[PDB]
Amino acid sequence: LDLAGPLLAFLFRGMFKNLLKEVRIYAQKFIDRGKDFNLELAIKTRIIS
Amino acid sequence: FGVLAKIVNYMKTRHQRGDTHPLTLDEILDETQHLDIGLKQKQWLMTEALVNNPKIEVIDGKYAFKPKYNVR
């Protein structure tokens, strides 16, 4: 039986992977330009919540 | 080899003058402020390679008549 914990763990796995993907994309643009991207701006807070 | 394409541009402006006459490489190199040494020999090897594909016509004798269509 899958309770609340395992289900939320599956969802959070997916959403954290998406968050890291978005960080990768946003930082890659700035790295290509040669600017030293800010980590706080890269993180899209809305994804997980 | 780049100086060679520059010589091609020079003879193109020479056509633009309309006073085109049978020439040679030494006078062009002098008027374009360049010397006559073994460098001219290697660039003349390149220039003969050019004479193998001189759509801008550069023949050895009486020459330089580029335009495939040319009357005035």
């Binding site: 040669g34 | 080899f1 394409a5 520059k6 580029k66």
Partner: protein, 88 residues
């Protein structure tokens, strides 16, 4: 502490300082630009406009004018239509 108020982001100020120190590329004389272009072509036959701009260190409009004077754009199966530094 997160998202603390800053007048300007550190990376942006570093990038702006670098750009200001470098300055805009100056429009050099036609003769010198042409000579540099011919040497570049001597390296090998085909150049893209972006890297040619990098090599010549000239304004894009001025370089494009000088290149249109002699060079010609060829549509090619390499990736796209690019410039040809051979005048003919």
């Amino acid at each position: 502490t997160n998202y603390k108020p800053v007048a300007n982001h550190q990376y942006n100020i570093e990038y702006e300082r670098k750009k200001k120190e470098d300055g805009k590329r100056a429009r050099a004389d036609k003769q010198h630009v042409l000579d540099m272009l011919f040497s570049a072509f001597e390296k090998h036959q085909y150049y893209n406009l972006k890297d040619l701009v990098d090599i010549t260190k000239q304004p894009v409009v001025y370089l494009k004018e000088i290149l249109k004077e002699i060079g010609v754009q060829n549509v090619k199966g390499i990736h796209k239509n690019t410039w040809e530094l051979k005048p003919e």
